[PDB]
Amino acid sequence: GLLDGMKKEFSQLEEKNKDTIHTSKSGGGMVSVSFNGLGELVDLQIDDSLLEDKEAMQIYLMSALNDGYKAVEENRKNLAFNML
Amino acid sequence: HMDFSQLGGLLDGMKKEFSQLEEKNKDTIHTSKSGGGMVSVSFNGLGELVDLQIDDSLLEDKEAMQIYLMSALNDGYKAVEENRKNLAFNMLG
Amino acid sequence: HMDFSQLGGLLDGMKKEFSQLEEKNKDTIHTSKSGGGMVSVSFNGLGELVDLQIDDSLLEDKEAMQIYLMSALNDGYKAVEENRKNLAFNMLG
Amino acid sequence: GLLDGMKKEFSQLEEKNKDTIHTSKSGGGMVSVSFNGLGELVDLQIDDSLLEDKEAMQIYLMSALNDGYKAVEENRKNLAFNML
């Protein structure tokens, strides 16, 4: 009943989640990514300057993406911790 | 509608609540008497026996003393376990 | 039919299982490709991005590069989150 | 479903519990108490010698009773830990 009732409440935190957008940057702002509350990647932008250095570009891309996903996950976990 | 991260968060939250409740239980005293008050037992809310007092008069009748000890102790154990069942259902509720 | 001590034991057991599963998840690699294989992304089972490889040809067309990155990344995120939902339901099951 | 299914299984560990008896001793065996698997106190025995020293008697009684209850509780918790 507990877990099922919580499952029912997690669905309420969906129409909220789906609209909420969080942006993470890296490489001095040369990479920007945005995730919605559902964890969907809804924006990705790379400064042309980074095309000159693929290896750095890939590192900054991973940094920004992991920060954004970390935020989605922390939100999932923290809302669950509080609910019960 | 739940993913593994949410489940881990719920488990952590439940364990936090559980520990907070156990500390409160440990601080709660329940006293049971028998033998016209000649036996008194006290338990904490974990079910640990924390005090036990027997009237000197009962030292003259060990048979009665044992019966009254068992009566008070069982009343106390039943009471604490009923509280502990209630708390499990109510925490989940 | 459950008392507070049993609930605490269950919570502890579930947290042990949860941690064991998370360690296994962290060791599992999922790879998604897009752009005819010109983009490859790898996630672990926690959803951390652990590798990212882009063909040098895409450096000539950032518009395409971004589209193919987003496609592969979203495919990977969806896959890991589906696994993580499944695991929550199945652990409980 | 999990908690409810476990609740259903805890009831199976009742007809087993109710019959199983565990004995705890203290005061060099001058106190003996027995609990069943349900946590009911089903036996208590005090050596006549202890009637000569009520304070020691009460201490040994508490020692034996707490050891026996500890055993009941550890059993409850350990069977729950393993089940899920």
UniProtKB/Swiss-Prot annotation, chains B, C:
Belongs to the YbaB/EbfC family. Binds to DNA and alters its conformation. May be involved in regulation of gene expression, nucleoid organization and DNA protection. SUPFAM superfamilies: YbaB-like (SSF82607). GO terms for molecular function: DNA binding. One of its GO terms (cellular component) is bacterial nucleoid. Gene3D superfamilies: Nucleoid-associated protein YbaB-like domain. The keyword Disulfide bond does not apply. Keywords: Cytoplasm, DNA-binding. It is found in: Cytoplasm, Nucleoid. This is Nucleoid-associated protein HP_0035. Homodimer. Pfam families: YbaB_DNA_bd (PF02575). InterPro entries: YbaB-like_sf (IPR036894), YbaB/EbfC (IPR004401).
